[PDB]
Design an enzyme around this catalytic site. Structure first.
Site, PDB file in Angstrom:
ATOM      1  N   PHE A 289       0.751  -1.260   0.079  1.00 56.55           N
ATOM      2  CA  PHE A 289       0.056  -0.086  -0.078  1.00 56.55           C
ATOM      3  C   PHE A 289       1.107   1.275  -0.117  1.00 56.55           C
ATOM      4  CE2 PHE A 289      -4.064  -1.958   0.796  1.00 56.55           C
ATOM      5  CZ  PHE A 289      -3.767  -3.154   1.370  1.00 56.55           C
TER       6      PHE A 289
ATOM      7  N   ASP B 225     -14.528   4.423  -3.963  1.00 60.45           N
ATOM      8  CA  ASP B 225     -13.747   3.220  -4.298  1.00 60.45           C
ATOM      9  C   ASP B 225     -13.766   2.178  -3.274  1.00 60.45           C
ATOM     10  OD1 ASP B 225     -12.847   2.392  -6.876  1.00 60.45           O
ATOM     11  OD2 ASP B 225     -10.809   2.196  -6.350  1.00 60.45           O
TER      12      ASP B 225
HETATM   13  C1  LIG Z   1      -3.779   3.663   6.302  1.00 63.13           C
HETATM   14  C2  LIG Z   1      -4.242   2.431   7.482  1.00 63.13           C
HETATM   15  C3  LIG Z   1      -3.529   1.435   7.712  1.00 63.13           C
HETATM   16  C4  LIG Z   1      -4.305   1.122   8.764  1.00 63.13           C
HETATM   17  N1  LIG Z   1      -4.084  -0.227   9.696  1.00 63.13           N
HETATM   18  C5  LIG Z   1      -3.471  -1.371   9.149  1.00 63.13           C
HETATM   19  C6  LIG Z   1      -3.367  -2.213  10.063  1.00 63.13           C
HETATM   20  C7  LIG Z   1      -2.662  -3.577   9.585  1.00 63.13           C
HETATM   21  N2  LIG Z   1      -2.513  -4.595  10.616  1.00 63.13           N
HETATM   22  C8  LIG Z   1      -1.614  -5.507  10.016  1.00 63.13           C
HETATM   23  C9  LIG Z   1      -2.240  -6.866  10.217  1.00 63.13           C
HETATM   24  N3  LIG Z   1      -2.256  -7.288  11.671  1.00 63.13           N
HETATM   25  C10 LIG Z   1      -3.422  -7.981  11.698  1.00 63.13           C
HETATM   26  C11 LIG Z   1      -2.564  -5.730  12.471  1.00 63.13           C
HETATM   27  C12 LIG Z   1      -3.408  -4.795  11.790  1.00 63.13           C
HETATM   28  N4  LIG Z   1      -2.301  -3.673   8.370  1.00 63.13           N
HETATM   29  C13 LIG Z   1      -2.481  -2.412   7.546  1.00 63.13           C
HETATM   30  S1  LIG Z   1      -1.869  -2.875   5.851  1.00 63.13           S
HETATM   31  C14 LIG Z   1      -2.641  -1.496   4.969  1.00 63.13           C
HETATM   32  C15 LIG Z   1      -1.914  -0.311   4.722  1.00 63.13           C
HETATM   33  C16 LIG Z   1      -2.394   0.604   3.907  1.00 63.13           C
HETATM   34  C17 LIG Z   1      -3.817   0.610   3.698  1.00 63.13           C
HETATM   35  N5  LIG Z   1      -4.420   1.451   2.929  1.00 63.13           N
HETATM   36  C18 LIG Z   1      -3.930   2.522   2.498  1.00 63.13           C
HETATM   37  O1  LIG Z   1      -2.587   2.867   2.968  1.00 63.13           O
HETATM   38  C19 LIG Z   1      -4.740   3.572   1.890  1.00 63.13           C
HETATM   39  C20 LIG Z   1      -5.094   5.077   2.392  1.00 63.13           C
HETATM   40  C21 LIG Z   1      -4.240   4.842   1.092  1.00 63.13           C
HETATM   41  C22 LIG Z   1      -4.382  -0.622   3.863  1.00 63.13           C
HETATM   42  C23 LIG Z   1      -3.835  -1.795   4.598  1.00 63.13           C
HETATM   43  N6  LIG Z   1      -3.011  -1.459   7.910  1.00 63.13           N
HETATM   44  N7  LIG Z   1      -5.040   1.996   9.081  1.00 63.13           N
HETATM   45  N8  LIG Z   1      -4.979   2.914   8.414  1.00 63.13           N
END
Ligand SMILES: Cc1cc(Nc2cc(N3CCN(C)CC3)nc(Sc3ccc(NC(=O)C4CC4)cc3)n2)[nH]n1
Lengths: 43, 253
Positions: free
Chosen positions: B19, B131
């Site tokens: 991401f 989206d």
């Molecule tokens: C931006 C964001 C990300 C989060 N939270 C998380 C949390 C997470 N986790 C990793 C796995 N364990 C179970 C703990 C939770 N993994 C991701 S991996 C991930 C990274 C980015 C995005 N999406 C974005 O960055 C979009 C907004 C541009 C989705 C998933 N994102 N909160 N807000």
């Protein structure tokens, strides 16, 4: 990279729940989102 | 008001590159946990999406909803643009769908109620599309949906600011999501693009035994070739199946 205590495991989890039940004033903490100034940024 | 990279503490990276550049952080003064996303101007300049971003930020600016991932504020240095975003503790939906394989009626119906309200909210705030591909969906502390959305002379401004998607594109995507949640894969998946396209335009929808009647009805009403025939948001959150099985939690928002 070593991962801070606060960001790892349990102490993360508690920090999140507190935060979830204590929704602060966001206008205070962050302010007013200004229009993005495309020129004072890419020049 | 003002911000710098110097007043956050990084915890760990989140994307695994998937991401982009995204980080668990907290603000030093408050110990408030955000997700911080770094955007390189060189990647933006390149793809020529400076007006999308400008406008995207204006969109997010006044979008306060517990099922829309919150943008708190932003800031920039000589080379990067940093977004201070809401942190979704349970991460990405599509991973939780893998752990689950499929979702029960309650989880899936709950997610349809959350989407329908998030999008209705958005229309009422002059934001006519969002989206919804499963990539864009995150999970709150108590499991709650969190929609996270970022990404010549005759061109009108709406084309330059990216705002060209129709209102009724999402209604379709809602159908697709609902199916994929219950079946564990999208309804028109195939060995090849050529075959998938043929399936999408012919709406060759087939329901397996693992989809309850009520879902078949909703999904069949959303997945219509003709966009005017697609089931309105207001009727999606009022669908009997959705309403009977939805056990939705709300945060102190
Ligand atoms: C931006 C964001 C990300 C989060 N939270 C998380 C949390 C997470 N986790 C990793 C796995 N364990 C179970 C703990 C939770 N993994 C991701 S991996 C991930 C990274 C980015 C995005 N999406 C974005 O960055 C979009 C907004 C541009 C989705 C998933 N994102 N909160 N807000």
């Amino acid at each position: 990279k070593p991962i801070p205590t606060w960001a790892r495991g349990t102490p993360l989890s508690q920090a999140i729940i507190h935060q979830y039940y204590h929704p602060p004033n966001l206008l205070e903490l962050f302010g007013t989102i200004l229009p993005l100034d495309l020129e004072d940024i890419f020049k | 008001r003002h911000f710098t990279i110097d007043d956050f503490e990084i915890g760990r990276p989140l994307g695994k590159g998937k991401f982009g550049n995204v980080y668990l952080a907290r603000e030093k003064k408050s110990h408030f946990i955000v997700a911080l996303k770094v955007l390189f101007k060189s990647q933006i300049e390149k793809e020529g999406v400076e007006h999308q971003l400008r406008r995207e930020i204006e969109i997010q600016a006044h979008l306060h909803h517990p099922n829309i991932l919150r943008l708190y504020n932003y800031f920039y240095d000589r080379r990067r643009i940093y977004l201070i975003l809401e942190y979704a503790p349970r991460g990405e939906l599509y991973k939780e769908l893998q752990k689950s394989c499929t979702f029960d009626e309650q989880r899936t119906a709950t997610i349809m109620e959350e989407l329908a309200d998030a999008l209705m909210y958005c229309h009422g705030k002059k934001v006519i599309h969002r989206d919804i591909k499963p990539e864009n969906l995150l999970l709150g502390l108590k499991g709650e949906l969190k929609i996270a959305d970022f990404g010549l002379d005759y061109l009108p401004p709406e084309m330059i600011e990216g705002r060209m998607h129709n209102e009724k594109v999402d209604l379709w995507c809602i159908g697709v999501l609902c199916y994929e949640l219950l079946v564990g894969n999208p309804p028109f998946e195939s060995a090849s693009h050529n075959e998938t396209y043929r399936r999408i335009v012919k709406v060759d929808l087939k329901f397996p035994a693992s989809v309850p009647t009520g879902a078949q009805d909703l999904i069949s009403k959303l997945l219509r070739h003709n966009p005017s025939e697609r089931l309105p948001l207001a009727q999606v959150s009022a669908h009997p199946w959705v309403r009977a099985n939805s056990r939705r939690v709300l945060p102190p928002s």
